[PDB]
């Protein structure tokens, strides 16, 4: 009891919003699929019939060189995955909107391109699951009490 730390109890990972229509620009893809999967495993059912939708628009996978070899050639690549999500409510009204991103660095080989592509793929999978984790944490903090307060 010196620290103040103690195990998590149901009341924390309760997930207030227990139902939401998860859709994406990439209608069928690893991101959205594993997202709906994680949510369902968390206790939240996913259905097109819903007043509240989580829409994933523009998932972007960027890559840039961040370090260089002794011959001024690419040594390490930095992959940055960025998903732009918006929460939509009644009558196609964008209730809110934000982005979530993550980035990781891997060693690129100029003489082993396919291996580097595999490494990049695995890295993209891990980053994917991390982004889904973050989106989960964000959706958990939501409450149905937060309304549209639309005004025009």
């Amino acid at each position: 009891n010196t620290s103040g730390f103690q195990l998590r109890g149901l009341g924390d990972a309760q997930f207030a919003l227990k139902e939401i229509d998860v859709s994406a620009r990439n209608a069928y893809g690893p991101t959205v699929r594993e997202l709906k999967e994680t949510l369902e495993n968390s206790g939240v059912k996913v259905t097109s019939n819903a007043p509240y939708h989580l829409v994933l628009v523009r998932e972007d996978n960027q890559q840039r060189t961040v370090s260089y070899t002794g011959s001024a050639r690419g040594a390490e690549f930095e992959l940055t995955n960025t998903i732009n999500y918006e929460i939509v409510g009644a009558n196609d009204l964008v209730l809110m909107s934000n982005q979530v991103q993550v980035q990781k660095v891997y060693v690129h080989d100029e003489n082993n391109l396919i291996g580097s592509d595999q490494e990049a793929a695995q890295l993209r999978s891990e980053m994917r699951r991390d982004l889904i984790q973050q989106l989960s944490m964000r959706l958990q903090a939501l409450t149905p009490a937060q309304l549209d307060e639309a005004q025009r």
Binding site: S3, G4, F5, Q6, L7, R8, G9, L10, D12, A13, R25, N26, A27, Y28, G29, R33, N41, T65, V66, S67, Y68, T69, G70, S71, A72, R73, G74, A75, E76, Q103, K104, V105, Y106, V107, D109, E110, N111, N112, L113, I114, G115, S116, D117, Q118, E119, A121, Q122, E126, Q134, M137, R138, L139, Q140, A141, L142
Partner: protein
């Protein structure tokens, strides 16, 4: 106002690099754009002739793509003696992606150049570095709710003459799916793959007039199974049973990996080198069980920093991994690479990528992650620390990194221990803020050799939604890189020539109203050499915008003798803009 449709000339740009000489570009923006646009880039150069580029872009619901073209009649000369030299420089490629709404995803990533020196002479967009290859791939993907099938035809075109010819995955078919289950029951997964790796080696020596030979392509440095081609089938069924609780989770997983190779050795590889040392088997076989137990706990806490309430979660994680040892030295490497050590390394079923090498395992990976979440669900900070404890050794290594180095290489690089009882300590830190504050750190310390393997400290500074003030400070270190050696035909650990210890500085800052300073400096402490350094001013008038910089940078080069040389250049760059 509209005026997004500038269907006329775009604000031009000048460049005097004292190497490319006077260079004027005068872009034209074809705004046939309800949803798709076009752009023409007529670049005039002094040392070289007049060239033109064409960039088409289209963006719609369920579709996205960019088409690129470029042509130049080479005025500049005396790159004649260089091999694969062309006077008609051209580039054409398609980066497509269709069917994001359907279950049929058609991706395309094609790019064909005229000669390896296209980017080393004409490309200035990617300034500091320069791509040594371009993608020639086409992917068709069906994606059911329960499974996912993919036909992929991927290849690469060398934008250099000093790298080995890349392998082709002419037909890579993958079928990865799961099985419907009920909460409390077992979960079944399966991953199948079939790839035909092929490659057209060009080991033909290039000549002179009096000097006779002057250098041979790197492909002629490949020996034995390094010259191998052929097909590979992988079957990987697996089962998992995740017992999840609100405070912790324990997930046992048992998989089985079966890989079979139908190889071809092109004779020169097998008749000469192999027979000179060992035997060759075109029919190869591998079968391994895999056990993975993943446990973890969840702790919570309530803190308050600067009035802002944060939730500091403590997340300890443990993972046991068992894979029995099988001699895989008789196998060739096609898609396998060995990534350097990090925190993620602790939670991977295999320390290798691809399927050519399955790491012999008997490990207990221990780690922890403390993260700070503000009650809107936002992750503001994250700290991760871990280490792997080895109960056995790591015998399965890449070609040239196993006990080949003991014999046919007589080498023992510093910092390489595969027989120690523990891994380096892995630290991964991250501190974020929405008004674009962002510091990211990574550090890996080997206690056995008492040496730093990998280091990283990246910092991105911005103020209160003011896009004028930006400050980037980065420090990077890397000495555990495992890369294929062109001059040795095998893999190599910690190349003395390619060891990374570099810093990257960048800044944009307001001096006086309508004026701002722009600067950047990349420096390699290993060569004690500056990669890139530019500085200048940006005048932001009420009507126009003027950016002028003095720039010094190194560009990649491969001389007539086919060795990787770095060659620098200084120049003045000017650009106008209306926004």
């Amino acid at each position: 106002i509209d005026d997004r449709r500038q269907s006329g000339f775009l604000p031009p740009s000048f460049s005097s690099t004292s190497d490319t000489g006077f260079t004027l570009v005068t872009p034209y923006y074809f705004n046939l754009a309800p949803n798709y646009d076009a752009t023409l880039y007529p670049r005039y150069m002094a040392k070289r002739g007049m060239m033109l580029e064409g960039e088409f872009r289209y963006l719609t619901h369920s579709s996205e793509g960019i088409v690129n073209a470029a042509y130049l009649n080479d005025k500049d000369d005396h790159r004649e003696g260089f091999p694969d030299y062309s006077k008609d420089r051209w580039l054409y490629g398609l980066k497509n992606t269709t069917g994001l709404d359907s279950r049929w995803l058609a991706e395309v990533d094609y790019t064909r150049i005229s000669d390896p020196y296209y980017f080393q002479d004409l490309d200035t967009d990617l300034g500091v570095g320069s791509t040594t290859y371009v993608n020639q791939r086409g992917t068709l993907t069906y994606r059911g709710d329960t499974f996912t099938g993919r036909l992929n035809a991927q290849a690469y075109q060398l934008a250099t003459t000093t790298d080995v010819t890349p392998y082709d995955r002419l037909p890579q078919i993958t079928f990865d799916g799961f099985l419907p289950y009920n909460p409390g029951g077992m979960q079944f997964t399966y991953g199948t793959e079939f790839v035909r790796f092929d490659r057209d080696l060009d080991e033909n020596i290039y000549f002179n007039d009096d000097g006779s030979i002057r250098g041979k392509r790197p492909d002629a440095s490949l020996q034995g199974l390094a010259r191998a081609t052929g097909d590979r089938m992988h079957l990987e069924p697996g089962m998992s049973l995740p017992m999840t609780r609100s405070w912790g989770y324990v997930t046992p997983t048992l998989k089985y990996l079966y890989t079979k190779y139908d190889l071809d050795l092109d004779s020169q590889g097998k008749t000469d080198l192999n027979k000179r040392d060992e035997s060759f088997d075109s029919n190869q076989d591998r079968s391994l069980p895999l056990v993975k137990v993943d446990s973890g706990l969840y702790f919570d806490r309530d803190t308050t920093f600067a009035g802002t309430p944060f939730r500091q979660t403590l997340e300890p994680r443990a993972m046991y991994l068992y894979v029995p040892y099988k001699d895989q030295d008789s196998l060739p490497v096609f898609d396998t690479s060995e990534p350097s050590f990090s925190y993620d390394s602790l939670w991977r079923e295999n320390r290798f990528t691809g399927k050519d090498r399955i790491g012999d395992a008997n490990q207990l990976s221990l780690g922890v992650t403390s993260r700070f979440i503000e009650e809107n669900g936002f992750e503001r900070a994250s700290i991760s620390a871990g280490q792997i404890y080895y109960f056995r050794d790591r015998r399965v290594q890449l070609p040239g990194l196993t006990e080949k180095d003991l014999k046919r290489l007589n080498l023992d690089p510093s910092g390489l221990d595969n027989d120690s009882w523990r891994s380096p300590y892995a630290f991964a830190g991250q501190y974020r803020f929405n008004r674009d504050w962002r510091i990211n750190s990574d550090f890996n310390w080997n206690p056995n050799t008492s040496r730093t393997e990998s280091g990283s400290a990246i910092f991105h500074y911005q103020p209160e939604v003011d896009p004028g003030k930006v400050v980037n400070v980065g420090y990077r270190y890397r000495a555990d890189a495992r890369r294929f050696d062109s001059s040795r035909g095998t893999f190599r650990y910690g190349n003395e020539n390619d060891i990374i210890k570099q810093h990257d500085f960048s800044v944009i800052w307001p001096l006086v109203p309508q004026w701002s300073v722009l600067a950047r400096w990349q420096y390699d402490y290993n060569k004690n050499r500056t990669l890139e350094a530019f500085g200048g001013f940006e005048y932001d008038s009420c009507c126009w915008k003027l950016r002028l910089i003095n720039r010094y940078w190194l560009d990649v080069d491969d001389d007539a003798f086919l060795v990787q040389s770095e060659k620098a250049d200084r120049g003045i760059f000017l650009q106008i803009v209306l926004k």
